[PDB]
Amino acid sequence: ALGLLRTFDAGEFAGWEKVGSGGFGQVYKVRHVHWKTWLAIKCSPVDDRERMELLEEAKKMEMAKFRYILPVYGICQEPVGLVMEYMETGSLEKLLASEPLPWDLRFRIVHETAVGMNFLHCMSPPLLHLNLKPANILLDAHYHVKISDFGLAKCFGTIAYLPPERIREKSRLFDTKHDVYSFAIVIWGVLTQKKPFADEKNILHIMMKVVKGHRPELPPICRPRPRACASLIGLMQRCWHADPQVRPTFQEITSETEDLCE
Ligand SMILES: [Cl-]
């Protein structure tokens, strides 16, 4: 698991350039000078708890090596950091804010995301992502999906992606149905090109309502692809069902999202 990962010196990198920040904080586009390609490095903002947690993150990424999962290359220690593949086009969040997207691409993004999530849940034991949102869905130069940010995975803003049972229950056992809910809200974002609950300012009221079955407002049926759109809306609704056990598996989800790409 941790054997094939490489150790990097900062001298191996150059042309450092910030691409995103926050809690994890400081992600940079870097050029590996000897390999002549760009990589991504997420740095720290010191102790042994971070070093072991960062190493855990890398090992989880490595175990899930897949077409729709971001590759990990290894560890820097000049600044302590996770070294991984660079995704030129950046996040789905930015893509949805940029301009209206063609529906064929929207369905492909949904489908590829679902195939990525399915892969994780097919592992033994299942790997739960638990932080799936457009901001963590990265896109390559040809707009194909690779799932990213395994910081919260297990063997403000995030409230919208939180399943209602996580609000109902103090300290519930994390399961596959968590990810399925979050995926529902990803679908909603792809359908609308909006962020969920972006206008409503009362976070607590809207969270309370979510425990009792309140969800983001259903979008209308689009003109270009009204049948596929209806189907996707329906799938979304099943994925955000109040009862976790009624929600589809990603095995079922992928069967349906595949048909949307026809
Ligand atoms: Cl259609």
Side-chain angles (χ1 to χ4, degrees), residues 1 3-17 19-23 25 27-48 50 54-58 60-64 66-77 79-158 160-169 171-172 174-199 202-206 208 210-262:
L4 291 168
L5 302 189
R6 295 172 200 248
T7 301
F8 293 87
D9 306 335
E12 296 187 62
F13 305 125
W16 292 69
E17 187 176 317
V19 296
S21 52
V27 176
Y28 304 91
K29 182 188 179 162
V30 291
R31 187 173 172 78
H32 193 287
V33 298
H34 288 325
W35 292 356
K36 287 122 180 298
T37 47
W38 300 91
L39 297 171
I41 177 162
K42 186 192 77 165
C43 300
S44 175
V46 186
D47 71 328
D48 294 319
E50 290 197 63
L54 193 75
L55 178 51
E56 284 272 11
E57 193 183 347
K60 291 194 290 280
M61 289 179 82
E62 189 88 320
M63 282 167 59
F66 190 53
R67 180 182 203 77
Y68 301 120
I69 300 301
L70 190 76
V72 65
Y73 284 103
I75 303 292
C76 188
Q77 262 158 359
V80 299
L82 185 65
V83 178
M84 48 215 149
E85 180 156 287
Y86 177 59
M87 304 292 293
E88 287 178 33
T89 309
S91 71
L92 186 54
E93 183 182 57
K94 186 174 79 187
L95 182 60
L96 294 164
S98 74
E99 58 178 314
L101 305 181
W103 287 92
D104 64 348
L105 175 57
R106 296 200 219 193
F107 297 135
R108 200 185 71 187
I109 286 160
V110 167
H111 174 58
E112 289 180 356
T113 304
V115 179
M117 292 305 298
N118 183 72
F119 186 81
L120 297 179
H121 291 189
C122 285
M123 292 168 73
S124 53
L127 180 41
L128 310 179
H129 191 77
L130 309 172
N131 194 23
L132 180 71
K133 59 200 195 195
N136 294 340
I137 293 157
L138 290 180
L139 297 163
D140 68 15
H142 301 287
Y143 298 86
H144 292 287
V145 165
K146 292 197 190 201
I147 290 158
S148 311
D149 195 3
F150 289 77
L152 306 177
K154 301 293 179 65
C155 302
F156 180 81
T158 60
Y161 301 92
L162 207 56
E165 66 269 25
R166 194 131 288 281
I167 302 163
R168 280 197 293 274
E169 298 163 36
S171 302
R172 173 188 160 84
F174 288 111
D175 57 10
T176 62
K177 304 308 202 199
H178 185 124
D179 285 336
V180 175
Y181 186 89
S182 307
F183 179 72
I185 309 302
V186 172
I187 291 163
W188 190 88
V190 172
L191 289 171
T192 59
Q193 299 201 220
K194 292 174 181 163
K195 294 166 71 164
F197 305 128
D199 305 333
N202 202 336
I203 77 178
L204 286 172
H205 172 70
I206 212 81
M208 183 214 62
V210 164
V211 164
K212 294 182 278 175
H214 184 57
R215 299 289 181 270
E217 194 189 16
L218 287 200
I221 311 306
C222 72
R223 305 282 187 78
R225 299 290 299 284
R227 300 176 78 176
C229 183
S231 283
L232 186 48
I233 288 166
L235 175 55
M236 182 185 63
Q237 291 176 86
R238 290 193 272 131
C239 293
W240 75 26
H241 197 292
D243 188 0
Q245 308 311 137
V246 180
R247 294 170 194 157
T249 63
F250 273 101
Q251 195 81 356
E252 295 170 323
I253 291 160
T254 48
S255 293
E256 298 190 30
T257 54
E258 194 167 42
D259 296 354
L260 300 193
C261 297
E262 295 274 56

